[PDB]
Amino acid sequence: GLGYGSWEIDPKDLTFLKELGTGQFGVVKYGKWRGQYDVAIKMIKEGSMSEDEFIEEAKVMMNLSHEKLVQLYGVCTKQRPIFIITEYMANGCLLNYLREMRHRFQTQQLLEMCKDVCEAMEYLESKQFLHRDLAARNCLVNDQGVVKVSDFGLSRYVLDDEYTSSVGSKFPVRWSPPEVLMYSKFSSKSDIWAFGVLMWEIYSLGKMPYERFTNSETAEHIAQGLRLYRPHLASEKVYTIMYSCWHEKADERPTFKILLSNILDVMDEES
Numbered sequence: 001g002l003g004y005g006s007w008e009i010d011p012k013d014l015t016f017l018k019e020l021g022t023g024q025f026g027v028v029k030y031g032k033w034r035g036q037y038d039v040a041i042k043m044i045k046e047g048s049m050s051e052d053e054f055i056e057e058a059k060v061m062m063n064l065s066h067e068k069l070v071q072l073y074g075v076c077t078k079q080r081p082i083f084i085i086t087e088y089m090a091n092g093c094l095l096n097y098l099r100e101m102r103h104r105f106q107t108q109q110l111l112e113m114c115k116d117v118c119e120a121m122e123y124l125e126s127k128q129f130l131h132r133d134l135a136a137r138n139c140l141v142n143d144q145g146v147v148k149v150s151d152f153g154l155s156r157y158v159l160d161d162e163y164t165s166s167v168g169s170k171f172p173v174r175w176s177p178p179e180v181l182m183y184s185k186f187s188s189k190s191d192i193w194a195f196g197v198l199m200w201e202i203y204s205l206g207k208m209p210y211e212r213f214t215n216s217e218t219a220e221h222i223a224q225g226l227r228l229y230r231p232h233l234a235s236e237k238v239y240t241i242m243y244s245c246w247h248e249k250a251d252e253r254p255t256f257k258i259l260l261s262n263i264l265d266v267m268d269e270e271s
């Protein structure tokens, strides 16, 4: 209503129900909007985000809508901390979900998680929108077991320089292609590379990529042309798909449309 733009939610419409955890920007809670609608509420710690830039970008994110993309519902920016209001994902972070061995996943379920993410990324690619930090830690799982891509583009607004460049202690070295580590060249093809690593994370049930190496050692390994190798649960065909994401030459890496086709083909053959 009065005083709120289309990208703005009235925080008074929120009912807080459960604490879900704390991440980069701070706490995330489960709640309801206007009594009935499930939402997640991301409370953005003061000093952690370039807030004016993020708010302008939220207007763009409002228009991104895909079944495999965690939906942005709006922002609460009239006070601090500001809130980001999103779709609720009852089963939490993908990385944690993978690591719970009780699920006893079939490989068909693992491939479906990859397809979920690939569909979201194909959609983002169709909108010329880069994720910029794709990884299992940035995917979420709903009550139906569907994986969705989360926090797309949000790394652009992080003020902690330890996260923001390779010269940083918290940069996602293990999800970055050589041209990012060497020259900071981000593109659709750096998202493609990251997606391959995410496939590896899924098929590895949430192991850390290059688990015996430091970040520094990982950068040397990949810049020297070496790669992750095949997770035990990945068939040859699945391995071929993730490996294709890691061509040294960015322009030899597939698009998300091509990866989706390849994933569907393997589903059909492995079903």
Ligand SMILES: NC(=O)c1ccc(NC2CCCCC2)nc1
Pocket (backbone or CB within 6 Å): 020, 021, 022, 023, 024, 027, 028, 039, 040, 070, 086, 087, 088, 089, 090, 092, 093, 140
């Ligand atoms: N959209 C959601 O429902 C939702 C659910 C859990 C969650 N967990 C985060 C994992 C990393 C630490 C902070 C909590 N983040 C978002």
